[PDB]
Amino acid sequence: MNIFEMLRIDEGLRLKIYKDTEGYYTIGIGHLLTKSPSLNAAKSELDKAIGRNTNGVITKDEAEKLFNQDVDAAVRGILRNAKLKPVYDSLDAVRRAALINMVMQMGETGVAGFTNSLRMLQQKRWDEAAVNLAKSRWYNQTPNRAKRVITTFRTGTWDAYK
C-alpha cells in the first residue's frame, strides 16, 4: 500500500463531473474544480486543466494524470509549509502518507490550522493526537474517512485500509 492507493480508496474515481461531499464540482480522483456554484465555470476549469474541450467527461488516463499532479503538488505544499515541513520530516513513511492525505483533502492551509495536533504528532504522542484530531469539523463531516487517517497516525500501519 502507498499514497496513491490510499487516496484512491478514499476519493474513488469518477469520469464525469460530480459534486463532492461539500457540494463542489470535482472530477476524477478528488480533483476539485471550483468552489463556484456554476457548472460552466466548472467545465471551463476542466477544459483548462486537461487542455481540450472535454464537455465534462475525461478518460481514465487524464484522471490519473490529474491525480499525479495533485499528489505532487500536495507533497510540495507540505515541504514549503513552515508549519508542515517539520512535522512531516519527523514522521515515519506511513504516517507521512497520512499527513499528505489530509493535505490533499483540505489544503495546506486547512491542515496547518491543526496546530495542536501537529505538535502532538511531532512529539509522537499517538493516542493523544488521535483524540485531538477527532475534535474537528473534519471528523464530524467525513467521519469514516477521518477514522481511517487517524488510525493511520495512531498505529503507523495500513490496517485501516486493509
**Interacting residue ranges for Cl ion, rule: CB under 5 A:** 49, 142, 144-145
Q: Is residue 19 within 8 Å of 35, Cβ to Cβ?
A: no
Q: For residue 69, what is its C-alpha cell?
A: 499532479
Nearest distance from C-beta of residue 144 to Cl ion, angstroms: 4
Q: Is residue 16 within 8 Å of 56, Cβ to Cβ?
A: yes
Nearest distance from C-beta of residue 86 to Cl ion, angstroms: 28
State which residue, 148 or 154, has the beta carbon closest to Cl ion: 148
Q: Which of 10, 11, 45, 62 is catalytic?
A: 11
Grid cell 499527513 in the structure block, residue = 99
Nearest distance from C-beta of residue 94 to Cl ion, angstroms: 20
CA distance 107 to 101: 10
Q: Which of 20, 47, 70, 128 is catalytic?
A: 20
Query: What's the N-to-C CA distance of the chain in angstroms?
Result: 9
20 classed as catalytic: yes
Indicate which residues carry an active-site annotation: 11, 20
